[PDB]
Each structure stands twice: as structure tokens, then as C-alpha cells.
DNA sequence: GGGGTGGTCGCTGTTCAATACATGCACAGGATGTATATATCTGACACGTGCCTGGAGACTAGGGAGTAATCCCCTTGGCGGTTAAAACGCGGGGGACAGCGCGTACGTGCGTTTAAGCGGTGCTAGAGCTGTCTACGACCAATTGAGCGGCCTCGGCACCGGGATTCTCCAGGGCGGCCGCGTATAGGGTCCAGCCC
DNA sequence: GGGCTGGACCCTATACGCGGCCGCCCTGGAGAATCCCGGTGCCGAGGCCGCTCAATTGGTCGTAGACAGCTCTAGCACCGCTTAAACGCACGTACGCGCTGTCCCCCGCGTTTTAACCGCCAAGGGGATTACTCCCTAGTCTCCAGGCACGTGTCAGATATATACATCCTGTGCATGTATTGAACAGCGACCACCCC
């Protein structure tokens, strides 16, 4: 039979994988393409430096783990441990967003 | 070692009889105080009152399997 | 005739530039006037500060067994400590990752 | 020429990892919807900041030390794309 | 060759030098130290600056700038800080 | 490849009034985390010096420190009754922290809540408390010290109220364990299999997470004694 | 038997009330003895303007009142009615105090 | 002239007042402790604030000015005292 | 001799004092030099902002049937908005109180 | 003999009056509103001038102070005041 | 008591290229607070000058607007062939909001999505969506128009979705009512009791809380008809 | 000698004990993933060099701030009645919370598809740097009227007492479902009549 | 002639329906609270009045930046290829949530304590204002060395592969509590023998 390890395990070996290292987790050239839609929403025929969709990127990672964070906060407040559309909504509307 | 669970699972149910009949908690409490170690027999009570419940001894009020409260049969 | 040019960081014992800072301070637009003092205050201040970072962050940086200061190793060295987490509470570092945390509740039995 | 549809890009397995390094260990189904929603709204803040400082510079590149301006003004001070 | 673009690099590097003699340091971490000298100069002269006009003085003295750090620096750093601050005042003083 | 820090005068008898110096050697380079500690007898010891030069708060102008590197000395000027105490330099430029052998000188709010002596038969275990109040618990980390009159001062560990960080001498692993509690603003330290070794008072001190900051308030000592 | 409200409708009645009225609601002489006992540890021989006492009642007010709707979404998240110290923790940190 | 024990008139009817006007209906007996508890921190942190100003100017007496300036400073800026 | 004085927040059509607003922008140490049009720019917005909110200040006061505008009013017209309210969110009005707001699920039945 | 303190608060009655004829305003109430206008004023100074220096410009003009505008103003708000601030301009440029 | 709009000319003849002028008075002083409208046979109105002078966006120069307090204008300066519409002033200054009665001109990305048609018999109950897209939701409202052929335009009542605030023409009240949905973006209007003459054309229109901002954005318009 | 009764033996039924089965707990072994170790090789850090521009040195000029005097405001302090609020206690309702049971939503794994990443090349839009010249803003002196402090006064509103309406809680009357007993029914036992052995 | 069986009848057993009782909902009544309205006084808004200082008019000097021209960098496009990641599907477990029951923790409402509030007076500390005056700092010209850009080389480490340990999951073996069946013992029935009339 084969193996399987019990749903929570991966999980976990996947917190402490991604907990460790540093390096960007959404890809690179669909958030460069997002990046340029909402530009382009705004003023067209916009160039954007290398370094300055890196930076939108960083920006955007760190933004979204610290909501993560204070999301799982809350899901544990309900006695929880899957994170759901109304913590994210309880952290935004705590944190005043 | 004493006797199996249903003999004090029907004694504890038949020591009071209120109009509805015991729950799990109070009935567990009962076997507590009158001696056993529920803390690693739960599921030997909850097996207990299950069979108790298909044999027709006991009958079940509101809940479903070990939930709800249970009094006696009929007679 | 002019005596040997020595520099305002030399005087005041710092690393950090007593000079380029007054020219910050000056033309910042910060007040019409610039004490003398207030560049080497404000020089001695920036220097502890960096030192502080910097001695941190090179003893992580030793503890990873690496020989070379990374922004990991900033981030680590910030987030450990409180007061330095204090002072750069809403500051964002580039690729300094996170600290490894789990909330207990989640760990197995 | 036109884009209409990119948010789609940041896939599930990319929001999954983002969590994974929040510390998240289970994931609702519409976590992923409401993630894409949310960092939508905070990429159109602060690009809306950035082409403004953009325009003001009369420049048709928008610039690191442009993001780097817009975050600051929208308390989010980020380090390391300065110079 | 192109417009001269100054920087805390050499003086980060030399008081990396100080304290730990045999580390070297990244050029990404070398851009977030200028980066945090850069915003710690600013927060600390805009306070400085917010003190002056509050106190309806022109010149921004080392005891505004020993009070803005004290409001802005928590605790022992704000007081390491104040420290350091004295002794290069007084020292460069006494010349 | 501890750091033994040498005291040269080992005790020194001195009139009042006249100046008195103390010399402390490193074996390696600590780099200006020096600190000097007056201990009056039965007492817990205060802190003079800090960073090799600097006075501690409410410390008279009359103590004085000096040095760098490896050599460093502690002058008093103006010697008064109370001076007479045993005075021990600690550095904390390396990870083990080293008190000095201890300067015998006989001469012609933040509070640390500790708990009392105990009397405990070997092999069993013994939890010491400590109660901090007066200061925001988390920015300190709390270490502990153990004295005996054969062996002198030892630094044994440090916990980090902020984020339950340690760090242990080599001497006291498994030995002793640190905890905090921050709704009790509490410490606790833990022996295991205690020895007649074990016989002496522990005691609790602050310190700032600041390098340059050293072991500013100190509990009463708690004297525990193995049959 | 005499007439007795169920719990909770004087509850609600108070929440009306108070959230119809503007006045401070802590007691001005306690919390002006409190302020000058707070300050007394950071430097002696003080002095306070009435106004100065005043400016701080409001803003303590204000933070408390915000701090106890926080602390309320918490509580309601939790599919409690009843706010408490964890509540309130929760509330906190998620505001990154 | 000496105060000691004063975080207790901060009593609890007035801390229930609080939380009705923040439209809680339903009070654990222990909120009143940690409520105490924040209270004095949040003042401990702004008169802080106040009295370094007031002492930069040299005075003795704690203006509104100062505690304004005080909670500008920690981002809780207050309207009708001066500003 | 000399043609008589016209202010200039008259030629602006402005309420607002253009000369002091030009004034308290030379002395706050925001520039060097200050262009003419960037005092009557400010004293448009300011006098523009100030009449909207006097303007909801006094429909609320309208509303409750009083003549006088109080802070109250001024509370409940930057609450009620959500421009206002973003402009406003981090500011404290003395006297103001909150908005009557009771969350659904503590609504009996 | 009392020292001239200047406030915001005759024109902010002349704008009451031509908003709400006859509607009046209470002591505290003026007093906020000169807070108010106080901080608006601070916050778009302010914008202008790390503009000014973002662009190394050295004068702060009716340009900078619409990108402030622009800036701190979410939507509407920004909208109308750019409105308002360029009739202002083109009034006073021709008066 | 409320106010009446009256345009005076109400039927204009024009050549192309040359000029028209249409004028509006008012009962009460509306304060400036007078927007004007072009509507194209069996089309959304589109907005041309809010605040009686501003131009709309996208609006050319050749409309223009002027007047204030009761007596206003509006002016077309070049006429092409498709100026051929009718034009509704709208005041907005007071609760009641009034359109004018409507001139009639012959020459010789924000998407409000409104639902299809529906057929109704008196007595029951039609509930008609408004699906908004394109625009931060929450800040604006949502107002609702009724165009019968014989009435022309009325205004029945707006809802704010941020508070959930609404308020209502006197005419509608109990007819009309208003519901939000911030988790779809979807205004509901739910109309009451039905009868013949509630058989009309009633338009959704997005406006923002602004005072001077008018019915910028309009629904393409949902006829509802009464056997 | 016959009949009846009691005793003994055999068979059946019941109870007890033994055995087998269902349930759960603990330990061991295997799989696997992270970790730990060198090897390698590419490039990023670090050091040398030269040039130039910005910081240091010396002087002028004046004004910002420190320091002293004086006034009087506004903060502190003690005092004594008046309630309003705080405090304490008690009965009880409802809400927190613990235990359980069920369904399905989410985790893990695997095969297929997709597109991201790299690397390499070509092109041009625009960033950015320099030079001119000038429109516009800083700075100073004379003029005056707009704004600030003072005084007053009077009308909006806070307070209050008396009805009004609405809301909130409990009690009384009409109604539904379940259980015990009563009524009707069916099955089995019985007694007489007929048939067979 | 007798016993067995079938038919008719009576006695007992069983199944379903109805009235009484427990639980539930709807409507009316009482009282408390919130409002609302008219009267009343009182103090803050807001209007007038005079002075003064800062805003305006006017003029001079220069320089910040608008603009035009040129360079050359890097951002954008494109294309092929490799392969890792995303996707879609299967399947199973554990987690969310809904229900039930218990207990005790706040809530509402009295009575008692207290201390806050407010009006009052009295004292003096220090804030604020003004004046003098001198120490420090801006502005300026000259000079050289510290720092920045260019260039180059080489060692720390990123990447790769091979092995090691720690952890995770599950299979199996043992323990134990329970259910079933078989055997053993005892009780009852039947048959034979003995005693009594």
C-alpha cells in the first residue's frame, strides 16, 4: 500500500519550509501583468522599472502574510482552525482597513 | 472488578427516574459517585448505552446515540 | 597659512559624517537655523543605532554560520528584539522573510 | 494590447503558500476569492499614489523610489529599494 | 562617469568594521542600512523641527535634538542613544 | 575557551578618605562589556559600573571605571563606611558570561520579588519564583546567578519575557530550566536532580536586551540549602 | 410580584442612552487624581491645566469606547455575547498595540 | 499630597458605561481588571508624551497644548483643545 | 498717490485670507520659496472642505430640529460619510459621542 | 494688556453664514473646525513640500499643491477641491 | 411645498451650427444645487452640468451653463444632429429633488447593470435589482428615478450602502422601498401594492454623497408594466 | 390379591462457567523528508586608484536667544452641604461550554497540461544631463484697513413638570398530540354428536 | 361399545380508537420608560467699537526653472526550449457545526455608604511679557582631501549529490471485557415396587 501522510502533516512541514526562507512566493511576470492592468486603469501607455515591480511585489507578500497571520489569529479566537472570509473580514475591520 | 457497565448503567437510570429520563453527564456523574473510573471508560459507556438502546432495555428521549437522555423501558 | 584640515567626526570621535549630516539638516528645511551641536547629536545618534543593527544582525548572521550580513539576518536581529521591533514596527525589509512561529493549538497532540 | 483579466494569476497554489508562511494550516475554499479581492484593492491604493508622484515628475515611468513614496505615504515604510 | 550619488555605504561599513571585524555585509542588506539611517535622520529631524516651531524657536539645537529622540527611541535605546549623543557633543566641545 | 576575568587584588585594606583602585584583567578581548558589582555581606549586589566607564543610576560620582580591550581598573576616591563590600567585575561580550574572582575591601521603583530559602533532600526538584513589577515585564530579559562561597559567582541562563527566548551556561544544561509567565509577570527556574552541590543562593536580575546594558536590579536571593 | 425586566433589555436600554449622550462618563475627579498620580512617576512638581486634564479624559474615553466596539466584533466572531479579557487581548493585538 | 492606589476610581460602573456607549451588552467580571490594566497603560504612554514636551519647554505646568501635541505625535490626534 | 488696498483673497473670490495663508506657509519651513498661486490654491481647498462640513453640520442640526451648530453635529456629519470619515478616521472630535449603532445579533428574537 | 491670538474662526462664520444663513455655531464647535482647518492645512503643506524636495524644486506652487491635493483627498473630495482650487487660481490670475 | 421646476420653452426648432438656449426657474432658492440632462428617445438620460456650470466628463465645450439662485440656463453653441434629444434640469438642493418638465430639441469604467422588463398585475409585488460595477460601491449612492410619458421624471428615493441610509420622496413612501447588498454590489428597489398607474420607466442613477456632485451614472432602465 | 402411594431413576431445563470474539492500546519497523557533509563553479564583495567637489578654515555682521524684572492669572488647597452615584447583596434567567454525532469540505497524492523562466537579440522611448534666458519670487519701505480684544445684550436652549404613547412582560383562553383504558373482535378451549375401530 | 374428531358455543386474549392531560401559541392588560410639549430663566453667541500691526502697493535684484538639444540606457517585444508548477481528479479523514444538557455567572433591583460636585475663599507659583545684550551662526571666498566612480581579482556560498538521523504512520500483537454455547446439576415426571385394606 502506499504511503500517505495524515491530512495536517504536509501542512505543517509546508509552515516551517516557507517560514524559513525569503524568497517571493507569487510569481513573478502574472503579478508584473496584474501590475500593468491596474496601471493601465489608471494612465495608459505607463512603463514601470524592474525594481519598481519588485518593489510593488515585496509590498504586496508582506501585506498579504501579516493579514494571514492576523487571520489565523482569528480563526483560533472562534475555536477554529481553518481560516475563513469572515476572520479575513474581522482583521481587515479590526485593523481599521 | 465488579459487575459489567450495564448493571451500574441501569442502576444509575433507575436511581432517581425524573420525569425525563438521566442524561449522558448526570449518569456518568452517578457512576463516578457511586464508583467506577469513567475518565478511561467512556467509550465502554457510550458501546453500553448503544447496546442497551438496541436490546429494547432502555429507551431513548430526545438525542441520538449517546446524546439526549435516557429512561427506562416500558415495564 | 591654514592649519591641517581635520573633520567634525574626527573632533566628535564618530564614524558617521558630522558634515554631511549638518548639510542635510540645513538643506532639509527643517528650521532657518543649525546649531553646531545638533550634527554631531544627531550623527552619535544614527551611529549607536547602526552599530546596535549591525552587532545583532552579524551575531545571527554567526549563528547561521554564515561570514557575510544578509537582510535575513537584519530581519532576525529586528524582529527579536522588542524595542527594535518597536521602532521599526510598520517598516516592511526586503527579503528579510519571517520568524518561524506556530501557533500551538495547530501543533499535533 | 488590453489586459482583462490577471488577478486569476495569483493562483491557489501561490495564495496557499502565502498562508503556509502566515502560519495558516487549513484553508477555506473562498479564502482564495476574498485574498484576490483584498490584494486587488491594496495594489490599486498604492499604484493610484505611485502614478500620482509619477505625473507630478512629469515622467512616463513610474519608479521605485515612486512605490517607495507611495507605501511611506500609506504607512508601509519599505526597506531596500532606496538609491 | 555620472552625477556623484552619496551614501551612508562606507560609514555603515566602517562601524560594521568596529564591532564585528571579520563579517562582511551584502549589497541588499547595505541598501536596507541606508534605507533605516535615512528614515531615522528624517523622523528624528521632522520631530526636531516640530519642537522648534512649537517653542517659536529658529534654530534647531542639540537639546531639540536630545528631545525628539527621547520622544521617538523607546526606552534603553532612546537612553544608549541620549548617552552616545552627550559624549560626542562634549567631546567635540573640547575640541 | 571561557573568558576568565582576573581580579589582581584579591583583598585590600585601606584608610578613609584615600583612593583605592581595582584591576581586572580579561583573558580575551570582551570588547567594553564590563561591569562593576558592589556586594555588601548577607546582601544582594548592586551595580556600579556599566560599559566599563559608565555610572550606574543614583551611583555617587566618587566610583570610577576605566579600560578597554583586556586591562580594565575600578577607582574609589572618596572612601566612606559603607564602601567596605566585595566588588566583582562581570563581562557579557561573550555568550558564558564571567563574574570575577571578588575584591575583598576592608576599609578602617523596579522590583524583583524572590522567594525564601528552602530545604530540600538531594535528588528531588525545586522551583524558584520571580515576581517583577515596576517596569514593563517583556523589554527585560531576567538572569539568573548562582553563588557559592567556594566557586564564587556564576551567570547560569537568561529567558526573554518577549518571546520566551533562552540561553543556558554549558555548566547548567538540563540542570536548570527558565519559564516566564507574562499575565503573572513571573519567572520561574527549575532544578533538577539536585545535588549538596546545588547549596547556595540564587538570584534573579534585569537586563536589557541593549548590549551595552548590564544586570542593573538584582532580587533578594533565595537560599537553597541540599541535605 | 413586582415588575422586573429580563436580562438584557435594561442592557439595551443603556446602550441607547449612552450612545445618544456625548458627556465623559468617567468620574472627573478620580480620573484627574489618576492622571496626576501617573504623572507623578515621570517627573515632580507638576502642574495641569484644567483643559490639559480635560483633553485627556476625552482622548481616554475615545480609546476606550473604540477599544470596546473591537472587542465586541471579537466576542460576536466568537458566537459569544459576553466581551472578555481574550476578547480584548485579541482586539489589541490585532490593532498592533 | 501624595497618591498611591488611584487606578481604582476608575470604578465599575463607569467602565460598564464605557463599554455600553461601545455597545456591548454583555460584561465578564473580568473585563474591569484588564480594562484598568489598558487604561493605565494608554496614560502612561501619553502623559509620557506631555511631560517631555513640557519639560523641553521648561515649564511646570502641563499645558493642553503639550498633551495635544502628545497624542498628534502617537496618531490620535483630537479636535477642540487648541489645535 | 497709491491705489487703494483689494485683498486678495477679493480678487480670488475667496472667504479665506490668502495673505495669512501665504504668511503661515513662508514661516511653517515647507520651502524655500512659496509661488503666488500656491496661497490661493490652499485657501480654495481649505474654504472648499470647510463649507462642505459646515454644510452637513448644519443639515444634522437642521435634522434635530436646533439652531446651532455643536460638536455633536459636526461627529455625526463626518461619521455619516464616508469620504469625510476616511479623511477623518484617525481623529478624536471632543464632545462628539458615537453613532448609535447596536450590533444585529444582540437584538432580542 | 492680552497678547493677539489669530484663529480661523471669522472665516469660518462668514462660510457658515453663506452655507446656512441662519444657522449659528457654539464656542467648541468653532473650536474643532479651527483644529480642523488647522490639520488640513498641515497635512497638504506638508505633501507639497516632500514633493518640492522629491523633485529637487524649491518652490512650492500651485502645481504641488494639487498634487497634494490629489494625495491626501480619497476620490470626490480630490475631485471637487481641484475644481475649486483652479477657479481660485484663474480668478486671481486675471483679478 | 415642494420645489417646481419650470422650463419655458418647451419645444425648440434649430437649424444645425447655430445657437440654443434653454432656461429654468425655480420656486425657492436652490442654491446653485441645478443639474442638467440630455435624454435620447427611449435611452438613459446622460448628465451634462452639474453645479449649473461645471461640465460633465466627456461633455464637449459647446454646452454651457449659467445662472444662480432661481434663475438658470443652459446654452448649446454648435448644433450637430444628434443634439436632437429632450433636456430635464434637475435641482437637488433640497430633500425633495425636482426635475424640470422637459424640453424638446429637433434639428433638421462606471456600468450600473438594471434587470429586463417585467409584467406584473395589480396588487402584487416587483422587487428590481440594481447591479453596480466599476466604482468603490460604498461610496456612493444609489438613487432611483420613475419616468412615466405623462408625468416625466420623478425622483423616488436614494440609499447610501455604507450605512444602509436611505430616504424617500413623500410621493413613495410605503410604494417604494430600498435595500443594499455590499457582498454582490446590488441595490434592490421593491415596489408595493402595484396599480396602473405605477407603470413606468424607473431608472437607477449613481450619485456621490458629494453636495455638489448630481446623478452622474445611469442604468439603461427597467419598464415595469400594470395590466 | 388389588389398588394406591411413595421412591427411585431417567430426561429435560436451567444455570453457571469456559471459551472465543470484538475492542482498544502500545510498540516496532519501514518509509521518507529534512539535514549534514564535501565538491565546484560562478559572481558578488571588497580593495586599489584617481579625480573633483564639497567640507574645512578664517572673517564679517547681526540677530536669536538667554537672562533678568514684574505682573497678575490661574492653579492649588482647605471647607462644608447635597444628593447622585457607587457598593453590597440576593434571586434567577440565560448564556457559556463540554460532549457527541454526522456530513462533507478540505488535505494528500498522482497524471496531464500550461506557462513561467531563461537566454539571447533588436529597437526605440524616454530619462537625464547641460546651457540659455527670463518670468517670477525674495526683501525692504510706506500705508492703511482688516482682524483682534473688550463690552454688552438678549434669544436659543437646558431644565423641569405634566400628560402621551409605545414597549415590555406576564397571564388567561383556545388548540394539538400522546397515553391509558375501554370496546369490539378473533382465537383457542370445551362439550356434545357422529363415525370408525 | 368406546374413543376420536368435527361442529357449535363460550371464555380469554389482542388490537385499535377516544377522552383526558401535558405542552404551546396568541391576545389582552398593566405598568414603566422614553418622548414631547409648554413654561422659564440664564449665560454664551454674535454684534458693535476702537486700535494696531500685518497685508498691500511699489520697486530692485537675481536666479529657478522652463525649454530645447543630445546621449545612450533600459524597458518592451519576441522567440525558442526546458521543465517545474498549476490543474484537475480520486478518495478518505477529521473538522465544522448543529444539538442537548448542566451549571453557574452576570443582570436587574432594592437599600446603605460615600465621596463627588459645586459654590466659596484665600495664596502664591509660575507663565508670559519686555528689555538688554552678547555668543553663535549664516554668508562668503579659498583650498585640499574624502568620497565616489571604474576596474579587477578571488573567496564565500549557491547548487549538486551522497549519506544520516529524526519523525510519522500503520501493522500486529497483547490485554481485556463481553457474548455465546456447552456442560453439569437439580427438579420434575413416569414407572415400578411395596404396603395397606
Redesign the pocket.
Known amino acids: 500500500?502506499?504511503?500517505?501522510?495524515?491530512?495536517?502533516?504536509?501542512?505543517?512541514?509546508?509552515i516551517?519550509?516557507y517560514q524559513?526562507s525569503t524568497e517571493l512566493?507569487?510569481?513573478?511576470?502574472?503579478?508584473?501583468?496584474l501590475v500593468?492592468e491596474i496601471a493601465q486603469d489608471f494612465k495608459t501607455?505607463?512603463?514601470?522599472?524592474?525594481?519598481?515591480?519588485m518593489a510593488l511585489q515585496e509590498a504586496c507578500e508582506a501585506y498579504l502574510v501579516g493579514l494571514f497571520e492576523d487571520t489565523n489569529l482569528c480563526?483560533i479566537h472562534?475555536?477554529?482552525?481553518?481560516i475563513?472570509p469572515?476572520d479575513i473580514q474581522l482583521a481587515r475591520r479590526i485593523r481599521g482597513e | 472488578?465488579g459487575?459489567?457497565?450495564?448493571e451500574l448503567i441501569t442502576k444509575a437510570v433507575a436511581a432517581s427516574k425524573?420525569?425525563?429520563?438521566?442524561?449522558?453527564?448526570?449518569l456518568?456523574?452517578a457512576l463516578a459517585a457511586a464508583g467506577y473510573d469513567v475518565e478511561?471508560?467512556?467509550?465502554?459507556?457510550?458501546?453500553?448505552?448503544?447496546?442497551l438502546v438496541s436490546k429494547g432495555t432502555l429507551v431513548q428521549?430526545?438525542?441520538?446515540?449517546?446524546?439526549?437522555?435516557f429512561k427506562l423501558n416500558?415495564k | 597659512?591654514?592649519?591641517?584640515?581635520?573633520?567634525?567626526?574626527?573632533?566628535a570621535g564618530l564614524q558617521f559624517?558630522?558634515?554631511?549630516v549638518?548639510?542635510?539638516?540645513?538643506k532639509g528645511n527643517y528650521?532657518?537655523?543649525?546649531?553646531?551641536?545638533?550634527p554631531v547629536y544627531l550623527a552619535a545618534v544614527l551611529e549607536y543605532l547602526t552599530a546596535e543593527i549591525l552587532e545583532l544582525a552579524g551575531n545571527a548572521?554567526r549563528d547561521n554560520?554564515?561570514?557575510?550580513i544578509?537582510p535575513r539576518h537584519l530581519q532576525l536581529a529586528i524582529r527579536n528584539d522588542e524595542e527594535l521591533n518597536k521602532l521599526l514596527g510598520r517598516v516592511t525589509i526586503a527579503q528579510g522573510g519571517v520568524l518561524p512561529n506556530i501557533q500551538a493549538v495547530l501543533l499535533?497532540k | 494590447?488590453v489586459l482583462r483579466d490577471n488577478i486569476?494569476?495569483i493562483?491557489?497554489?501561490?495564495i496557499?503558500?502565502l498562508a503556509r508562511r502566515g502560519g495558516?494550516?487549513?484553508?477555506?475554499?473562498?479564502?482564495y476569492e476574498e485574498t484576490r479581492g483584498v490584494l486587488k484593492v491594496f495594489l490599486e491604493n498604492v499604484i493610484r499614489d505611485a502614478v500620482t508622484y509619477?505625473e507630478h515628475?512629469?515622467?512616463?515611468?513610474?519608479?521605485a523610489m515612486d512605490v517607495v513614496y507611495a507605501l511611506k505615504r500609506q504607512g508601509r515604510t519599505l526597506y531596500g529599494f532606496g538609491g | 562617469?555620472?552625477?556623484?550619488?552619496?551614501?551612508?555605504?562606507?560609514?555603515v561599513?566602517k562601524v560594521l568594521?568596529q564591532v564585528h571585524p571579520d563579517?562582511?555585509?551584502?549589497?541588499?542588506?547595505?541598501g536596507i542600512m541606508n534605507s533605516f539611517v535615512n528614515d531615522i535622520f528624517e523622523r528624528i529631524a521632522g520631530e526636531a523641527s516640530r519642537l522648534?516651531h512649537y517653542n517659536?524657536?529658529?534654530?534647531?539645537?542639540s537639546?531639540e535634538i536630545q528631545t525628539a529622540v527621547r520622544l521617538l527611541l523607546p526606552g534603553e535605546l532612546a537612553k544608549h542613544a541620549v548617552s552616545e549623543g552627550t559624549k560626542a557633543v562634549t567631546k567635540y566641545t573640547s575640541a | 575557551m571561557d573568558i576568565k576575568m582576573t581580579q589582581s587584588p584579591s583583598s585590600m585594606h585601606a584608610s578613609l578618605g584615600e583612593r583605592v583602585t581595582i584591576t581586572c584583567k580579561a583573558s580575551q578581548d570582551i570588547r567594553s562589556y564590563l561591569s562593576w558589582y558592589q556586594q555588601k555581606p548577607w546582601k544582594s549586589p548592586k551595580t556600579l559600573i556599566y560599559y566599563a566607564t559608565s555610572l550606574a543610576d543614583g551611583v555617587p560620582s566618587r566610583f570610577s571605571g576605566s579600560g578597554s580591550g583586556q586591562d580594565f581598573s575600578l577607582t574609589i576616591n572618596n572612601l566612606e563606611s559603607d564602601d567596605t563590600a566585595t566588588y566583582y567585575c562581570l563581562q557579557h561580550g561573550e555568550s558564558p558570561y564571567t563574574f570575577g574572582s571578588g575584591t575583598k575591601l576592608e576599609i578602617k521603583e523596579v522590583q524583583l520579588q524572590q522567594s525564601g530559602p528552602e530545604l530540600v533532600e538531594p535528588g528531588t526538584s525545586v522551583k524558584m519564583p520571580c515576581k517583577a513589577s515596576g517596569y514593563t515585564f517583556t523589554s527585560y530579559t531576567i538572569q539568573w546567578v548562582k553563588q557559592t562561597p567556594r566557586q564564587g559567582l556564576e551567570w547560569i541562563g537568561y529567558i526573554y519575557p518577549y518571546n520566551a527566548g533562552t540561553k543556558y551556561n554549558e555548566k547548567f544544561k538540563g540542570k536548570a530550566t527558565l519559564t516566564s509567565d507574562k499575565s503573572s509577570s513571573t519567572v520561574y527556574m527549575e532544578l533538577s536532580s539536585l545535588t549538596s552541590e546545588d547549596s547556595a543562593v540564587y538570584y534573579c536580575a534585569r537586563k536589557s536586551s541593549r548590549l551595552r546594558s548590564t544586570l542593573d536590579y538584582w532580587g533578594q536571593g533565595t537560599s537553597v540549602t541540599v541535605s
Request: charged letters at 35%.
Open positions: 500500500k502506499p504511503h500517505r501522510y495524515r491530512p495536517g502533516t504536509v501542512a505543517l512541514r509546508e516551517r519550509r524559513k512566493l507569487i510569481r513573478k511576470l502574472p503579478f508584473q501583468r500593468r501607455d505607463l512603463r514601470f522599472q524592474s525594481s519598481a515591480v480563526a472562534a475555536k477554529r482552525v481553518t475563513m469572515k | 472488578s459487575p459489567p457497565v450495564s425524573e420525569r425525563s429520563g438521566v442524561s449522558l453527564a448526570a456518568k456523574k478511561k471508560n467512556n467509550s465502554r459507556i457510550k458501546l453500553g448505552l448503544k447496546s428521549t430526545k438525542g441520538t446515540g449517546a446524546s439526549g437522555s416500558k | 597659512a591654514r592649519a591641517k584640515a581635520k573633520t567634525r567626526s574626527s573632533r559624517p558630522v558634515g554631511r549638518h548639510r542635510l539638516l540645513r528650521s532657518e537655523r543649525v546649531g553646531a551641536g545638533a548572521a554560520k554564515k561570514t557575510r544578509i499535533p | 494590447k486569476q494569476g493562483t491557489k497554489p501561490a496557499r503558500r495558516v494550516k487549513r484553508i477555506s475554499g473562498l479564502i509619477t515628475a512629469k515622467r512616463k515611468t513610474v519608479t | 562617469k555620472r552625477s556623484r550619488k552619496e551614501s551612508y555605504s562606507i560609514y561599513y568594521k563579517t562582511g555585509i551584502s549589497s541588499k542588506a547595505m522648534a517659536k524657536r529658529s534654530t534647531i539645537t537639546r
